[PDB]
Design a protein around this ligand. Structure first.
Ligand code: CLR
Ligand code: CLR
Ligand code: CLR
Ligand code: CLR
Ligand code: WOQ
Lengths: 333, 269, 50, 229, 217
């Protein structure tokens, strides 16, 4: 019964502790610190008139898409600041968006419980909603594209789903979280994905089968952001306890914790650099931090946002970092 | 000599403070992205007029009162004495138009917020600028060495100027702020602190009536040839208006939490 | 019961020592350190953002 | 679906109104052009109006004689011609074009309507006729007086294919990209001055005239045209 | 520097900016209300009088456009999406008077209202409180006195005194009385008067905000 569970939890904790021979801090203590990092506001995307909750970079590292309470997504050309597209939304309460890896579709969702997909390369010229993906019974946290046909989705229904856009329904529902799931991160090979939830747990899911491959705990509050390491064998979570963490899929435990006494504020977004050396965590203290992922030392600070930094992204070629904040302005560094 | 040096140093300090405060207000309004409203545009225009006074009139007054000599020329003295009237009346009418804006925003808020635009703010600033120009320029048309002062040629011109430049704005501000204070009771008693609003409105009215009322009553009593005026009282009352110029950004900006947070942001970089 | 079921499946996975994990992460970061425009300030000639 | 009307016989020195009715796309966000083709010569750009009618351009040959206007609520593009010359006779094509990052300008061309009356970058396409057989590759060469490789990397050169008795269609945009729905056979290549269009596994549907246009700056000038048969 | 296509792209961006500015002005002229309450608190009745996930009810009164956001379909954690409603000018909190004698839900309404009125996000948003199902209460108080709901009640078992006690409890649960205010009201089973009260509360909030911008409050 439940005592058997408890015994299994004790056994798995003992196995993790036995396998944790050393720590990332002492393993990478000898490496040269990256030094101070200075990041100027290379571009300032302005035109949003309400708090920005999400953005996603295109696969070409030039276009991006941002969602806010304006009731409309905006597709920006980050190189020249031009607004490529402005897609009016059916619901103004949008807290997620994604840009398809092929660049053809753009998804967005929120309190409407629907991850709507919009077609960008239509023949008529105006972006139109191709599908209205409904079936979640709670607010929508983050829906991420797999390809032009499949899309994983994380909602407050305590479950993550894998919808097929062509038919419009779920083909695999990932259940097992206790509370609201607020984050997603597809593996670079797109075969597994980690979802962080409000029960202070991040679960490694396998899309092909559907079972919860692994679970990772250690946070002391709700998890707000998650992002795979570029290698695809690790992932960093950012929660409300003002601590980031870097868990390993193969070791099935954390390796480093990113925290400081000065920061007593939760993490609203987490992303990695192209090489995985830098961990850019956008906090709710109106700013972002840049952590040496191998040393847990704050390698830089990104200030300039008048409000909470809600969304953060790093270009696929690592050339720039774009942070969107509640002050309705995106900043590309 | 020591007293003259003290007066000169005090006036230099005053004008530097005016310039610094006006620049700080302008920078905060132009940098903060939450302060882009028509009322803030009116306040910024008032700050611009104040900066014009500070960096175009105050140093000339400082040097003139101590040198007792104007070598810049008769034409330069005419230009200075005309731009002084123009810009001071511009500041006073900015006070009046901000009072009118607040009266609208408090009494007819529901539709006045709908009809309030940056175009309307620009129209209001244009109106105050043109009324100041109409008040000040025509002396250069019709009325035109060691010491040069106000030329009392026409009593009709003097009374026109004083009524149009201080008395009309004064009565307008008095009426508008009295209406605002009366309307503040509608949300203080008919709903369920009056001390805060009373203190703020009293301070605004007191500053306005304490700075430019002595100078203009002196203007009337010297334009009707009632009493003689000495240089000390004359230039003290003259610099009373510049003291108002100094206190104006503080009074009209320090009472907003949005401006306070803008200042906090601008004092950290 | 389903919770315990998930548990037993999660308890039957292969393990990698944290030393090996840290070695692999450090190796990846060092191998791709040169191709990271964030770590090394890219010259403005080939920097698309200016 | 663009269809034009208002052509026909006109006395020289007269005036005529050409109406382009559009149906099936967002006319408001689509820039429109007007490209005329002489009864025997190649295409020649005539007029251009932007989205919202904020920007209007004309060919320097006919500047000021034509007036191009838009009616988005009516969804119709009008072109008024005054004081026609005998050389003005041509078939006019209403050409859609939307400009943003990654868009395909000049993608859809109207059916065109005929009208008979009683420092610019010059593009050379001297290979006038190419005798070809089905199933064999072919290469068409175009040359430009000024290099089209702009400082932002885009090489503004378009390849259009006009079938005998059919309106032209966009074939390749920006010297590399393939228009939507075009067979993968076609490829574009070349430096900023000399350009090549390569067709592999040629079939009968490839018979026609190929035109190279430059979109680097106005006026837009087409090539002479290469005829394949 | 910018080629023809780049110039036209910039022009398209400027047109998009114009449309975005127009839409933003139109949306800023709107009045946003957040509707909250219990499942059986009569919010359905109230929205019927003015007319899956969130439910938007748009209506117009005295040339003022009100958008009511009902979040009754959200069963997740309140704090995870309550920060989205910072900009609402008022919170219409409906509480049923029939909740005092049917089970524990009166304490549920107590705790929900306390949390709503003590959120860090809603520190300056007025709460328009509606007392729904008052007609049934007026005759069922005699059958079930308010002492059953709260033994600490000490007064006549009349509907007027019970209503006064309820609107005293709700206001005592408030902690930010100096910043925000609770506009309590009784439905009286009518629509026009309810909407008129909502409009009065909204315009009072607007004028209070204008005084705050002036520096008076
Ligand atoms: C004479 C000069 C030196 C005075 C000081 C500079 C003035 C003119 C500048 C500084 C900051 C500027 C403002 C900055 C931002 C905006 C928002 C924009 O949507 C409309 C214009 C507006 C409102 C500007 C108007 C002009 C402005 C007020
Ligand atoms: C300095 C004096 C002597 C010369 C005249 C300056 C005039 C033309 C300037 C000074 C301050 C300016 C205003 C400053 C800010 C704004 C807000 C924005 O919406 C642009 C228009 C508007 C309203 C400007 C209009 C032009 C303006 C009134
Ligand atoms: C034109 C000549 C006679 C000079 C007149 C100067 C004075 C009397 C004028 C100049 C500008 C005028 C103001 C212009 C606009 C308004 C707004 C209106 O809703 C009420 C009256 C009011 C507030 C006017 C009051 C009178 C006024 C202050
Ligand atoms: C000759 C006349 C102009 C003298 C005026 C003196 C009085 C009215 C002035 C001089 C200094 C002023 C103060 C200067 C600074 C502040 C701090 C600010 O956060 C609130 C207003 C406040 C407190 C001002 C209130 C008005 C004030 C007390
Ligand atoms: C005290 N400053 C400068 C002196 C001065 C001022 C204000 C003034 C300003 C507005 C209206 C009237 C007046 C009076 C007046 C008349 C003629 C020349 C100058 C002045």
């Amino acid at each position: 019964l439940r005592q058997e569970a408890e015994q299994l939890k004790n056994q798995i904790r003992d196995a993790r502790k036995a396998c944790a021979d050393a720590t990332l801090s002492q393993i990478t203590n000898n490496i040269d610190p990256v030094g101070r990092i200075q990041m100027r506001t290379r571009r300032t995307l302005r035109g949003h008139l309400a708090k920005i909750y999400a953005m996603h970079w295109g696969t070409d590292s030039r276009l991006l898409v941002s969602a806010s309470q304006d009731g409309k997504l905006i597709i920006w050309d980050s190189y020249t600041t031009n607004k490529v597209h402005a897609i009016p939304l059916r619901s103004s309460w949008v807290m997620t968006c994604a840009y398809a890896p092929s660049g053809n579709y753009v998804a967005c969702g929120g309190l409407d419980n629907i991850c709507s997909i919009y077609n960008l390369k239509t023949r008529e010229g105006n972006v139109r909603v191709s599908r209205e993906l409904a079936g979640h019974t709670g607010y929508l946290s983050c829906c991420r594209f797999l390809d032009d046909n499949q899309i994983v989705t994380s909602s407050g229904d305590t479950t993550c789903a894998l919808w097929d856009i062509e038919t419009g329904q779920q083909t695999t529902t990932f259940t097992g979280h206790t509370g609201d799931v607020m984050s997603l991160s597809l593996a670079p090979d797109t075969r597994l994905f980690v979802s962080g939830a409000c029960d202070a747990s991040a679960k490694l899911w396998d899309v092909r089968e559907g079972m919860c491959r692994q679970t990772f705990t250690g946070h002391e509050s709700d998890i707000n952001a998650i992002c795979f390491f570029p290698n695809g064998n690790a992932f960093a979570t950012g929660s409300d306890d003002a601590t980031c963490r870097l868990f390993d899929l193969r070791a099935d435990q954390e390796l480093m914790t990113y925290s400081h006494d000065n920061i007593i504020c939760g993490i609203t977004s987490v992303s990695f650099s192209k090489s995985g050396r830098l961990l850019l965590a956008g906090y709710d203290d109106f700013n972002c931090n840049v952590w040496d992922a191998l040393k847990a030392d704050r390698a830089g600070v990104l200030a300039g946002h008048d409000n909470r930094v809600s969304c953060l992204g790093v270009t696929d070629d690592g050339m720039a970092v774009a942070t969107g904040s509640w002050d309705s302005f995106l900043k590309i560094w | 000599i020591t007293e003259k040096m003290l007066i000169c140093m005090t006036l230099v300090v005053i004008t530097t403070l005016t310039t610094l405060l006006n620049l700080a207000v302008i920078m905060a309004i132009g940098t903060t992205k939450k302060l882009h409203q028509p009322a803030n545009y009116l306040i910024c225009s008032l700050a611009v007029t104040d900066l014009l006074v500070a960096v175009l009139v105050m140093p000339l007054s400082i040097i003139y009162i101590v040198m007792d000599r104007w070598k810049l020329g008769y034409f330069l003295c005419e230009v200075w004495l005309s731009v002084d009237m123009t810009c001071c009346t511009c500041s006073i009418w900015h006070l009046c138009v901000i009072a009118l804006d607040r009266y609208w925003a408090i009494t007819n808020a529901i539709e006045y917020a709908r009809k309030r635009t940056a175009k309307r703010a620009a129209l209001m600033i244009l109106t105050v600028w043109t009324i100041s120009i109409f008040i000040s320029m025509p002396p250069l048309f019709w009325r035109s060495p060691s010491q040069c002062t106000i030329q009392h040629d026409h009593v009709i011109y003097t009374i026109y100027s004083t009524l149009g430049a201080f008395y009309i704005p004064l009565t307008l501000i008095l009426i508008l702020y009295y209406r605002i204070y009366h309307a503040a009771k509608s949300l203080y008693q008919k709903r369920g602190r009056e001390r805060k609003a009373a203190r703020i409105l009293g301070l605004i009215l007191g500053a306005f009536i304490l700075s430019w009322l002595p100078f203009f009553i002196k203007e009337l009593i010297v334009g009707l040839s009632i009493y003689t005026v000495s240089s000390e009282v004359a230039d003290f009352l003259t610099w009373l208006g510049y003291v108002n110029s100094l206190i104006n950004p503080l009074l009209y900006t320090s009472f907003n939490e949005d401006f306070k947070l803008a200042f906090k942001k601008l004092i950290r970089c | 019961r389903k919770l315990v079921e998930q548990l037993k499946m999660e308890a039957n996975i292969d393990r990698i020592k944290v030393s090996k994990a840290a070695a692999d992460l450090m190796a990846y970061c060092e191998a791709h350190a040169k191709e990271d425009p964030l770590l090394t300030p890219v010259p403005a000639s080939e920097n698309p953002f200016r | 679906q663009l269809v034009e009307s208002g052509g026909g016989l006109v006395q020289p020195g007269g005036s005529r109104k050409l109406s382009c009715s559009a149906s099936g796309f967002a006319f408001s966000s689509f820039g429109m052009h007007w490209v005329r083709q002489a009864p025997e010569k190649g295409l020649e750009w005539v007029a251009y109006i932007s989205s919202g009618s904020g920007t209007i351009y004309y060919a320097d040959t006919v500047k000021g004689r034509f007036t191009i206007s838009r009616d988005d609520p009516k969804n119709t593009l009008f072109l008024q011609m005054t004081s026609l010359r005998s050389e003005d006779t041509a078939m006019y094509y209403c050409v859609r074009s939307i400009y943003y990052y990654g868009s395909s300008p000049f993608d859809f061309w109207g059916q065109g309507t005929t009208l008979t009356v009683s420092s610019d970058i010059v593009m050379t396409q001297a290979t006038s006729s190419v005798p070809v057989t089905p199933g064999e590759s072919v290469s068409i060469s175009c040359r430009s007086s000024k290099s089209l490789l702009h400082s932002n990397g885009n090489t503004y050169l378009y390849w259009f294919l006009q079938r005998p008795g059919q309106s032209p269609q966009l074939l390749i945009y920006r010297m590399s990209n393939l228009a939507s729905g075009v067979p993968d056979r076609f490829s574009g290549s070349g430096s900023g001055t000399a350009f090549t269009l390569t067709i592999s596994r040629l079939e009968a549907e490839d018979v026609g005239v190929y035109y190279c246009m430059q979109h680097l700056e106005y006026p837009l000038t087409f090539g002479a045209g290469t005829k394949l048969e | 520097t910018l080629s023809a296509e780049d110039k036209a792209a910039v022009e398209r961006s400027k047109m998009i900016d114009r449309n975005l500015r127009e839409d933003g002005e139109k949306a800023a002229r709107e009045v946003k209300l957040l509707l909250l309450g219990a499942g059986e608190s009569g919010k359905s009745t109230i929205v019927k009088q003015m007319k899956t996930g969130i439910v938007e009810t748009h209506f117009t009164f005295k040339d003022l456009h009100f958008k009511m956001f009902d979040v009754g379909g959200q069963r997740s954690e309140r704090k995870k999406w309550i920060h989205c409603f910072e900009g609402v000018t008022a919170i219409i909190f409906c509480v049923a008077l029939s909740d005092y004698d049917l089970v524990n839900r009166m304490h549920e309404s107590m705790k929900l209202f306390d949390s709503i009125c003590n959120n860090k996000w809603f520190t300056d948003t007025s709460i328009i409180l509606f007392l729904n199902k008052k007609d049934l209460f007026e005759e069922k108080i005699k059958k079930s006195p308010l002492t059953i709901c709260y033994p600490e009640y000490a007064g006549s078992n009349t509907y007027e005194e019970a209503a006064a006690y309820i609107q005293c409890q709700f206001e005592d649960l408030n902690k930010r009385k100096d910043t925000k205010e609770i506009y309590t009201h009784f439905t009286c089973a009518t629509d026009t008067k309810n909407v008129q009260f909502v409009f009065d509360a909204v315009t009072d909030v607007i004028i209070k905000n204008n005084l705050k911008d002036c520096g008076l409050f």
